[PDB]
């Protein structure tokens, strides 16, 4: 067993399924196992599945682990891989989710599987201005920041997930730097254990990457036509996708006549490689994007408020070809803060972006519903924008307006890179990261970095945050033109609550009140409290109680 | 690795965590690990959790595995035990849920964890009249029965879960017999693997069962006072529970004085053992239950329909002190049979009503059963109230559905290992389930069986008892249906006047871009104004919660 010092407490790492590991901190210990078949998958991609045990917590944790280990597998490694985490003990103090990410790193590092790690992962909190490493369950209850960082060798950032109570950018960036430093300590522990254990990696049968010969011939056949498409700024999202597909159909029938010995899938990826390189070479060499935008330019943002007159609150935020419609519905407090945002994964990120500005003792449950009408790049950040608008339109006294944006990245391998403000879908697809960050015009509230490269330097993460605040200020200015303060009053059709003291009406088993809510549509509970969606329904409610 | 040949397929069982196992059938393979701590748990029960890998099906499968292995741990085994099932491969043909049950059996049998197995488990389906063991995914789609049975040695049943397409009783009974036969074939395979692997089981620290001395003294203190309570027929649920607790506090105080060295947990269980034995001895010796009822007697059953004015369908079913209130609410289809019941207890009531629900209904059927009073088998009452409410809402169901729970009290010869005498209890109380051996919940129509869930606390019961419990329940089910049909016996010819409406609307391509609007904004703006739901099929289907809402929706559509 090996030990790492992450500030106060420690972290022990051992072995045990192509590879197993146990990560313990305090009296919480997790066991993780990694397997990968030797027969290639018939699906033409890498099927990696992370199974976490502790239920929305499990799914979000499983994907946090997934994002921390995915970019480190070799390309074309199309082999069924399973990473299962089994919680062995929980002390209620040390959280196992961070241990699981590390457990997933050690398992693969000790395993057969080709995995260019190891990865270190810690949480960072801020308790009374103190930067806390892996805060305990109690410390997290009084922390202004919940940040999880997955670090690669040489201080490269693999995964960034954060929720913050509107902390300043300077602390947020300092907290990121702290966490990465500790991830480098953990990797020292892993690498020390792999030499004590003795690890030998297999030689996989075939890394399904296209041969340079087919890639070079595909380049000659499609470069100028692909360059033509990615320099024509009149293309929309669909006309540009279909334009490259027309070039895609003409070239491979030519490719099949040239390389009849080639796998049919090898012909598809060969065009994908060439289409990806042409797309990225334009942003790198000419500093322009496929729609004429430059690296820091937003798409045209417009938004309306109070379009649906019957609902409790409505907004529609439109940024380029990403258009969301958000509604607000107040329900009873009887189903921390009672606030929910629902997407129609994405919802959780938007909900975390608005969570800090939501008031505490609001008389009702606040439910935002973001319906995406058109998708073309990070509609979850659009949901936080539209959610802020619909919250103000409804009368919810939010502390400040929130906005989000996604920053992309196009690197040359890192000899050079381009940071893209407000990426299209195609820029996320052909890019290297999906840097979704939101907050107020004073601070950060949520961050989710979906980095595809085998890690990126701290400098790029810092500049991505700075570039995102510039875009955030512009978005908030457009938003504040539509509405900048929460409506002082809710709509007159808005729900109403009232308290009723009963003299010793509930009937046998509550049949009395089941009948009340069934007929009038109100909601009763306890000094009884009754919630009514409309003042009219409240009138039939007081009609019902007088007969009793 | 040992192979067990069932009828139409074989499964092979392997080894690998105090014990592991791999159960493979076809190219579907499940690995199950079993671990059990050697330090006693701070709690006063047995901490047993089963984690199944694949969600609702993971919860259901985990419970079915739990009922198949829980009754065979020795009493007083208060040690944290974990059974982890992990799916390695799923060929889409052979279902792994039954393979995991067997895995939990093999794993525990190969482990050092005290467990008096092994257990075999199979699925039984009837495909075109032929009884198929462990039917494939394709075979299950055309099966009139999904019966899962787990068997203990000597052809004892430990777990029985079934849903059936209203099949005949003798057909249902025949499947149980077939299933139990194939569980015994699996038990030989596991026993052979045990002798091949070599198994030496642990000696636990302590089995937290009360000593004969303290139990004998407890019996001296409480037997006659408890006997008078359990023969006092005027007691209801709460007054009998209060009288029993009044005797517990006096007795548990004298036990602490006579046994100061006894754990408080040994004092509580001593009284529970004596109260349980007294309760069961009255059923066995006098054939009378603690409410004066006889072994086959129902509680008073009454019910109503159409009590609530606003909902599309409502019903209120009461069985003794068990009262449920059921409602039907029609909703759009885009929100197999498009039928749901919302309450574990809900999936069983849903399975009971499912074969009777008609196909091709215009709206989605949402039944809600709210338990107002619970004193035994609210889940079967929810089935009866769901049948009444659905007939009240005008849903063209094939036949009414009733459900009932059957209890069991046994006396087993200690010189043997067999059951020496038993009494099957009809429509059991809560105290008859807690102090009893079995919660045999079965439901169906006047002519067949739609669902069954047997919660057998004993380490297996003979087939004969299960067959008698099924037949005894059919007598109770017909009595319940006769009372149910006097309130309502036919689905209403029409749904209620304010019921939802669905109509079709054509929009020519010229007005089509303006109707839907950019990204569908205008369609969703109409959904908020009128409370309507619009989906495309140049044809759009419109669902409205009210004929008025449809009227307003058609106006906005005509204005385009």
UniProtKB/Swiss-Prot annotation, chain B:
GO biological process: cellular response to interferon-beta; cellular response to oxidative stress; liver regeneration; mitochondrial mRNA catabolic process; mitochondrial mRNA polyadenylation; mitochondrial RNA 3'-end processing; mitochondrial RNA 5'-end processing; mitochondrial RNA catabolic process
Family assignment from sequence similarity: Belongs to the polyribonucleotide nucleotidyltransferase family.
Primary localisation category: cytoplasm
Protein's UniProt name: Polyribonucleotide nucleotidyltransferase 1, mitochondrial
Swiss-Prot/TrEMBL keywords: Acetylation, Cytoplasm, Deafness, Disease variant, Exonuclease, Hydrolase, Membrane, Mitochondrion, mRNA processing, Neurodegeneration, Non-syndromic deafness, Nuclease, Nucleotidyltransferase, Phosphoprotein, Primary mitochondrial disease, RNA-binding, Spinocerebellar ataxia, Transferase, Transit peptide, Transport
Localization per Swiss-Prot or TrEMBL: Cytoplasm; Mitochondrion matrix; Mitochondrion intermembrane space
Catalytic activity: RNA(n+1) + phosphate = RNA(n) + a ribonucleoside 5'-diphosphate
Entry's Gene Ontology molecular function annotations: 3'-5'-RNA exonuclease activity; identical protein binding; miRNA binding; poly(G) binding; poly(U) RNA binding; polyribonucleotide nucleotidyltransferase activity; RNA binding
Gene: PNPT1
Positions of post-translational N6-succinyllysine modification: 447
Domain KH: 500-557
Enzyme class: transferase
Residues modified to N6-acetyllysine: 181, 195, 216, 220
Disease per UniProt entry: Combined oxidative phosphorylation deficiency 13: A mitochondrial disorder characterized by early onset severe encephalomyopathy, dystonia, choreoathetosis, bucofacial dyskinesias and combined mitochondrial respiratory chain deficiency. Nerve conductions velocities are decreased. Levels of plasma and cerebrospinal fluid lactate are increased.
Membrane-topology descriptor: Peripheral membrane protein
GO cellular component: a single term: cytosol
EC code(s) of this entry: 2.7.7.8
Induction (free text): Up-regulated in cells upon senescence and terminal differentiation. Up-regulated after treatment with IFNB1/IFN-beta.
Role played: RNA-binding protein implicated in numerous RNA metabolic processes. Catalyzes the phosphorolysis of single-stranded polyribonucleotides processively in the 3'-to-5' direction. Mitochondrial intermembrane factor with RNA-processing exoribonulease activity. Component of the mitochondrial degradosome (mtEXO) complex, that degrades 3' overhang double-stranded RNA with a 3'-to-5' directionality in an ATP-dependent manner. Involved in the degradation of non-coding mitochondrial transcripts (MT-ncRNA) and tRNA-like molecules.
Known partners and oligomeric status: Homotrimer; in free form. Homooligomer. Component of the mitochondrial degradosome (mtEXO) complex which is a heteropentamer containing 2 copies of SUPV3L1 and 3 copies of PNPT1. As part of the mitochondrial degradosome complex, interacts with GRSF1 in an RNA-dependent manner; the interaction enhances the activity of the complex. Interacts with TCL1A; the interaction has no effect on PNPT1 exonuclease activity.
């Amino acid at each position: 067993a090996v030990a790492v010092d992450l500030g106060n407490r420690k972290l022990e790492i051992s072995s045990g399924a192509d590879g197993s590991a146990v990560v313990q901190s305090g009296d919480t210990a997790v066991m993780v196992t990694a397997v990968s078949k030797t027969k290639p998958s018939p699906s033409q991609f890498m099927p990696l599945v992370v199974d976490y045990r502790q239920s929305d917590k499990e799914i979000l944790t499983s994907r946090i682990i997934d994002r921390s280990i995915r970019p480190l597998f070799p390309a074309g490694y199309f082999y069924d891989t399973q990473v299962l985490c089994n919680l062995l003990a929980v002390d209620g103090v040390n959280e196992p989710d961070v241990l699981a990410i590390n457990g997933a790193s050690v398992a693969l590092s000790l395993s057969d599987i080709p995995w260019n790690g190891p990865v270190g992962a810690v949480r960072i909190g801020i308790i009374d201005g103190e930067y806390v490493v892996n805060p305990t369950r109690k410390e997290m209850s009084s922390s202004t920041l919940n940040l999880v960082v997955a670090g690669a060798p040489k201080s490269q950032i693999v995964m960034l997930e954060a929720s913050a109570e509107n902390i300043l950018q300077q602390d947020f960036c300092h907290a990121i730097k702290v966490g990465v430093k500790y991830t480098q300590q953990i990797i020292q522990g892993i690498q020390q254990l792999v030499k004590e254990t003795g690890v030998t990696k297999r030689t996989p049968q075939k890394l399904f990457t296209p041969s340079p010969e087919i890639v070079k011939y595909t380049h000659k056949l499609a470069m100028e036509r692909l360059y033509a498409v990615f320099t024509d700024y009149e293309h929309d999202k669909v006309s540009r996708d279909e334009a490259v597909n027309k070039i895609r159909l003409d070239t491979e029938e030519q490719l099949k006549e040239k390389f009849p010995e080639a796998d049919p899938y090898e012909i598809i990826e060969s065009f994908n490689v060439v289409a990806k390189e042409v797309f990225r070479s334009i942003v790198l060499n000419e500093y322009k994007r496929c729609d004429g935008r430059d690296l820091t330019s937003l798409r045209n943002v417009s938004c309306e408020v109070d379009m649906f007159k019957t609902l409790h609150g409505s907004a529609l935020f439109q940024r380029g070809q990403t258009q969301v419609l958000c509604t607000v519905t107040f329900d009873s407090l009887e189903s921390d803060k009672n606030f929910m945002l629902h997407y129609e994964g994405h919802g959780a990120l938007a909900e975390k972006a608005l969570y800090p500005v939501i008031p505490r003792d609001f008389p009702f449950t606040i439910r935002v519903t973001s319906e995406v009408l058109e998708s073309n790049g990070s509609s979850s950040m659009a949901s936080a924008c539209g959610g802020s608008l619909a919250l103000m339109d409804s009368g919810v006294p939010i502390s400040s307006a929130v906005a989000g944006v996604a920053i992309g990245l196009v690197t040359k391998t890192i000899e050079d890179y381009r940071l893209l403000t407000d990426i299209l879908g195609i820029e996320d697809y052909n890019g290297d990261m999906d840097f979704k960050i939101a907050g107020t015009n004073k601070g950060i509230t949520a961050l989710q970095a979906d980095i595809k490269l085998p890690g990126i330097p701290i400098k790029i993460v810092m500049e991505a945050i700075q570039q995102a605040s510039v875009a955030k200020k512009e978005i908030l200015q457009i938003m504040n033109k539509t509405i900048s303060k929460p409506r002082a009053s809710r709509k007159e059709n808005g729900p109403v609550v009232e308290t009723v003291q009963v003299p010793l009406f509930v009937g046998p088993g509550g049949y009395n009140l089941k009948k009340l809510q069934a007929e009038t549509g109100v909601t009763i509970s306890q000094t009884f409290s009754v919630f009514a969606p409309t003042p009219s329904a409240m009138h039939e409610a007081r009609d019902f109680i007088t007969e009793i």
